Amino acid sequence: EFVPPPECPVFEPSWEEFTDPLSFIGRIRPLAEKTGICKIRPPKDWQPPFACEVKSFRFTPRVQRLNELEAMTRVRLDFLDQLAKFWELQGSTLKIPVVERKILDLYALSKIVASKGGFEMVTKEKKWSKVGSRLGYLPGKGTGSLLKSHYERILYPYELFQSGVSLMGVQMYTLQSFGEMADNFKSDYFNMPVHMVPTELVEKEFWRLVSSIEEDVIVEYGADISSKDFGSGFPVKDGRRKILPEEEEYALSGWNLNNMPVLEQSVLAHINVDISGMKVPWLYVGMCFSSFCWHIEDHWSYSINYLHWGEPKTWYGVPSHAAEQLEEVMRELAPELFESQPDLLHQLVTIMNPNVLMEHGVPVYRTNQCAGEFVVTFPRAYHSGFNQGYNFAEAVNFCTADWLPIGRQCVNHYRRLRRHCVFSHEELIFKMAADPECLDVGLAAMVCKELTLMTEEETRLRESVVQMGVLMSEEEVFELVPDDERQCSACRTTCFLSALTCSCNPERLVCLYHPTDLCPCPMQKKCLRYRYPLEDLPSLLYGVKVRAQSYDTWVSVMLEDAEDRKYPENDLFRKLR
Ligand SMILES: CC(C)c1c(-c2ccccc2)[nH]c2c(C#N)cnn2c1=O
Ligand code: NI
Numbered sequence: 001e002f003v004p005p006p007e008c009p010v011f012e013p014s015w016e017e018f019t020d021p022l023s024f025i026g027r028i029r030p031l032a033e034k035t036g037i038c039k040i041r042p043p044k045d046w047q048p049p050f051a052c053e054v055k056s057f058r059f060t061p062r063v064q065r066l067n068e069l070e071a072m073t074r075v076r077l078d079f080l081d082q083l084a085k086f087w088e089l090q091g092s093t094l095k096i097p098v099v100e101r102k103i104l105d106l107y108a109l110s111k112i113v114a115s116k117g118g119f120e121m122v123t124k125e126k127k128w129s130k131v132g133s134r135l136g137y138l139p140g141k142g143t144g145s146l147l148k149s150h151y152e153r154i155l156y157p158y159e160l161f162q163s164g165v166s167l168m169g170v171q172m173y174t175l176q177s178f179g180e181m182a183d184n185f186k187s188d189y190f191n192m193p194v195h196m197v198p199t200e201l202v203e204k205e206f207w208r209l210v211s212s213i214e215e216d217v218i219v220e221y222g223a224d225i226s227s228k229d230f231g232s233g234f235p236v237k238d239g240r241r242k243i244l245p246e247e248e249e250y251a252l253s254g255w256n257l258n259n260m261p262v263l264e265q266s267v268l269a270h271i272n273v274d275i276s277g278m279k280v281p282w283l284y285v286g287m288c289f290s291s292f293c294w295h296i297e298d299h300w301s302y303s304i305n306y307l308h309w310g311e312p313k314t315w316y317g318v319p320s321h322a323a324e325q326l327e328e329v330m331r332e333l334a335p336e337l338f339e340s341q342p343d344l345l346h347q348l349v350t351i352m353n354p355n356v357l358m359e360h361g362v363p364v365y366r367t368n369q370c371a372g373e374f375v376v377t378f379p380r381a382y383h384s385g386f387n388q389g390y391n392f393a394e395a396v397n398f399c400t401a402d403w404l405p406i407g408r409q410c411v412n413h414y415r416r417l418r419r420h421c422v423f424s425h426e427e428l429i430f431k432m433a434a435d436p437e438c439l440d441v442g443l444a445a446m447v448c449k450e451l452t453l454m455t456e457e458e459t460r461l462r463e464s465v466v467q468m469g470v471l472m473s474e475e476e477v478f479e480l481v482p483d484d485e486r487q488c489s490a491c492r493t494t495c496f497l498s499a500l501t502c503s504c505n506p507e508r509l510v511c512l513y514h515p516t517d518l519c520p521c522p523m524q525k526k527c528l529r530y531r532y533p534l535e536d537l538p539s540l541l542y543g544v545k546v547r548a549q550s551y552d553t554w555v556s557v558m559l560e561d562a563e564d565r566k567y568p569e570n571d572l573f574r575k576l577r
């Protein structure tokens with residue numbers, strides 16, 4: 001009944017194209033960008049060894065119920081719609097809390113609490129820990145007594161209201177043993193050898209099970225796992241191992257996902273600055289039917305994914321130009337509710353069958369990732385998928401010259417939602433501009449174009465705030481203060497270039513895009529806390545414009561300077577020799 005979408009393109013690069021990944025991805029960008037994802041087959045000779053032992057590799061498995069994997073179900077949306085309207089009426093506003101890294105599922109929580117007789121029934125019987133368990137929450141972290149605090153503050157008033165009448169007060173595993181699991185599950189399900197069941201068939205049965213309430217199918221995966229903590233599946237040199245000469249090649253390879261962030265065309269390179277949270281790969285161990293819902297990467301940008309081994313991983317891509325369009329059809333499901341909770345759209349996980357996105361006009365491509373293959377995900381390309389059987393994958397995010405302007409556009413969208421930024425985009429740009437040499441000329445060029453847009457935009461914000469009646473101007477070093485203390489009162493964005501402080505709070509802050517929301521305090525005295533005085537314009541635009549236009553003239557001892565300045569080659573250098 002399910003229809004496989006069009007295949008996304010694969011690239012089988014020569015050993016010479018395979019030498020720089022970020023050059024090859026640029027080569028391919030104008031094309032693969034249109035499918036939103038692409039697959040990359042390294043040369044068959046390229047087979048890096050698997051660093052990790054398996055027999056002892058211990059991870060904590062998470063769980064997925066494919067029946068309830070979909071959070072955008074009709075019932076959950078009308079509940080949350082009705083709950084928000086309720087609170088709106090009460091003068092408050094519905095604010096959905098986060099519990100253990102992710103949003104609290106109120107519909108589940110409310111259902112469960114009410115099935116055992118409600119708040120004071122669960123309280124007096126101390127079953128709140130039983131609840132959080134059935135809600136999928138990891139013990140013994142005390143989530144139980146935390147949910148009670150949340151239910152009361154949020155669901156109890158609605159419980160009363162919805163309940164009869166009422167409502168007066170008050171108010172305001174081992175990788176080895178995992179393979180044994182996943183190979184046993186799959187064979188007993190399809191009654192074949194696990195390697196013998198065709199991709200098309202598992203893909204069909206997967207989407208069947210999602211919309212199928214006639215049967216429950218539970219599955220285990222593991223993720224939120226780092227190279228830092230558990231170690232990379234790749235060889236690489238830090239202190240912990242003598243590296244074998246057989247491995248020496250692959251340890252240094254640019255396709256080793258440990259090395260990508262530091263490649264000269266990567267942004268997270270020479271900045272010796274801060275943790276972005278993606279300079280380091282993550283690990284996904286997977287089963288048959290294990291899935292990952294529709295999503296884009298933080299700050300959009302790129303993700304590359306190597307399947308080290310095991311049965312294949314199915315992907316569904318969407319172009320970056322279809323992104324607004326994608327978000328729009330999902331929004332059609334609760335327009336009133338998504339108005340009040342703009343970011344709740346992203347917060348709610350969904351696997352919307354590609355078939356449904358297709359008939360709404362959204363391009364959806366796909367592919368089967370087979371062991372030893374790379375998948376690249378382009379900026380703001382929505383992706384999702386599932387695993388065919390037992391496997392082990394490794395992925396990192398990254399950023400490139402072409403991304404920079406997208407990254408700025410992302411903050412602006414993260415600013416128009418209420419969304420915490422995982423770092424400051426503008427801070428990044430200046431850290432790059434502050435070391436113009438030994439910076440890829442691609443970046444430098446793009447930086448100038450991108451920085452001049454900020455200087456203008458900032459000066460507009462710097463002169464717009466004085467009309468508002470601020471006088472005093474302090475000077476702070478923002479990068480050195482923790483991210484959550486440099487946020488904006490309601491934005492909520494990380495400030496670098498400038499912000500506004502009053503005496504209403506010793507530290508509470510607002511970016512120049514929302515000056516009126518700081519406090520009721522009249523303009524009167526101060527305080528515009530800035531970073532650079534406007535002596536920045538000549539200074540930093542110079543250093544970057546230097547190496548930017550030094551290369552422009554050089555193309556228009558000449559093969560020496562290119563080696564000293566670390567110019568790229570391909571192309572031009574070929575004519576040289
Ligand atoms: C099944 C699970 C281990 C999984 C998740 C995943 C894990 C936990 C929560 C959400 C997704 N994400 C991803 C991506 C991406 N992007 C690629 N593969 N992949 C996975 O296999
Ligand atoms: Ni992803």
Ligand SMILES: [Zn+2]
Binds near residue numbers: 491492493513
């Ligand atoms: Zn703001």
Ligand SMILES: [Zn+2]
Binds near residue numbers: 501502503504521
């Ligand atoms: Zn004030």
